[PDB]
Write an enzyme that holds these catalytic residues in place. Structure first.
Site, mmCIF file in Angstrom:
data_model
loop_
_atom_site.group_PDB
_atom_site.id
_atom_site.type_symbol
_atom_site.label_atom_id
_atom_site.label_comp_id
_atom_site.label_asym_id
_atom_site.label_seq_id
_atom_site.Cartn_x
_atom_site.Cartn_y
_atom_site.Cartn_z
ATOM 1 C CG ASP A 187 12.703 -37.718 13.021
ATOM 2 O OD1 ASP A 187 13.010 -38.814 13.531
ATOM 3 O OD2 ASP A 187 12.465 -37.586 11.796
ATOM 4 C CE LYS A 242 12.360 -32.788 3.502
ATOM 5 N NZ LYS A 242 11.974 -32.957 4.936
ATOM 6 N N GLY A 299 7.437 -39.310 -0.410
ATOM 7 C CA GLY A 299 8.519 -38.367 -0.635
ATOM 8 C C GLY A 299 9.626 -38.986 -1.457
ATOM 9 C CD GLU A 300 11.027 -38.123 -6.529
ATOM 10 O OE1 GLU A 300 11.082 -37.264 -7.442
ATOM 11 O OE2 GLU A 300 10.707 -39.304 -6.763
ATOM 12 C CB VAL A 301 15.890 -37.641 -0.774
ATOM 13 C CG1 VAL A 301 17.327 -37.072 -0.710
ATOM 14 C CG2 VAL A 301 15.102 -37.236 0.480
ATOM 15 C CB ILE A 343 16.806 -42.105 -2.806
ATOM 16 C CG1 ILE A 343 18.118 -42.521 -3.446
ATOM 17 C CG2 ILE A 343 16.485 -43.104 -1.701
ATOM 18 C CD1 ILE A 343 19.280 -41.679 -3.000
ATOM 19 N N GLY A 344 13.644 -42.983 -2.943
ATOM 20 C CA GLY A 344 12.407 -42.979 -2.159
ATOM 21 C C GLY A 344 12.644 -42.453 -0.754
ATOM 22 C CB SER A 345 12.096 -39.664 1.147
ATOM 23 O OG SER A 345 12.344 -39.263 2.487
ATOM 24 C CG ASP A 388 4.974 -42.378 3.773
ATOM 25 O OD1 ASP A 388 6.012 -42.675 4.417
ATOM 26 O OD2 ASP A 388 4.273 -41.373 4.057
#
Length: 267
Positions: free
Chosen positions: A134, A41, A21-23, A15-17, A19
């Site tokens: 965060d 990640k 990153g992906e997970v 999955i996109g994370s 801009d």
């Protein structure tokens, strides 16, 4: 070593994370043990040396954490220009969507236990001198036994106590929104909002308000109202986390002792 060779990883979801990153979720081969479910990640192709440096420091700090309420690092993939962080898999994912999809299914005691766990993780983290920046139910992960773990250390920084970043408005203390001064005390503000989310079962903070209404109403002194079923001592603790003066907010140590007291003698 914690370096993982690529063939040990089986990937089943990506999955996109944001801009760059992906997970991913999948399984990790571990010599002489059953395969371990993992979350990953990673940086996508085309990242800058700077993103790599920040990503690898994030991995490095995570690797030093050892606490029941802090996500465990399984290892890393850094060879041959890959950059992935492999962590334990959390059966029940993000705390906000978890409660939202199980609305009303837990007792107040179970919800306080979840909060105490987040509080313990934050106490561990702050005692080491880190500010998270965060903290939100979306970044608390839930295991199969309802254990809540603090995750996502990408914005985590060490203090000297404040820190300036050269933001998620609904969870951020006003002094950090306004003046970019982040502290353990601004994480305490965020913890209050998490307490609110949990007692509201993943309701969106300030759901009736636009972002600019949030900023102005909060500085004018507006505070999230107690969710239905919320005990009075719990609401008071939230309000205290949300003092305008950061120095008047309880520290995590105090937050944990307050929650422990309510678990020991329920109100």
């Amino acid at each position: 070593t914690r370096e993982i060779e690529a063939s040990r990883i089986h990937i089943e979801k990506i999955i996109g994370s944001g801009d760059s990153g992906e997970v991913c979720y999948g399984r990790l081969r571990v010599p002489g043990q059953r395969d371990v479910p993992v979350a990953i990640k990673a940086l996508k192709a085309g990242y800058t040396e700077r993103q790599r440096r920040d990503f690898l420091s994030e991995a490095s700090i995570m690797g030093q954490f050892d606490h029941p309420n802090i996500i465990r690092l399984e290892g890393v993939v850094t060879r041959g220009r890959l950059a992935m962080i492999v962590t334990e898999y959390m059966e029940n994912g993000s705390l906000d969507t978890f409660l939202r999809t199980h609305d009303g299914q837990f007792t107040i005691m179970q919800l306080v236990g979840m909060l105490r766990g987040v509080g313990a993780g934050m106490r561990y983290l702050s005692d080491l001198g880190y500010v998270h920046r965060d903290l939100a139910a979306r970044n608390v992960l839930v295991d199969s036994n309802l254990v809540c773990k603090v995750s996502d250390f990408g914005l985590s920084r060490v203090l000297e106590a404040a820190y300036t970043t050269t933001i998620p408005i609904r969870w951020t203390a006003p002094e950090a929104i306004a003046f970019r001064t982040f502290s353990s005390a601004s994480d305490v503000w965020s913890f209050g909002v998490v307490m609110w989310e949990v007692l509201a079962y993943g309701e969106r903070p300030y759901w009736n308000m636009t972002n600019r209404d949030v900023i102005s109403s909060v500085e004018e002194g507006y505070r999230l109202p107690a969710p239905m079923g919320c005990p009075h001592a719990l609401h008071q603790l939230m309000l205290d986390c949300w003092h305008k003066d950061r120095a008047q907010r309880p520290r995590f140590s105090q937050i944990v002792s307050v929650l422990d007291a309510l678990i020991r003698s329920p109100e």
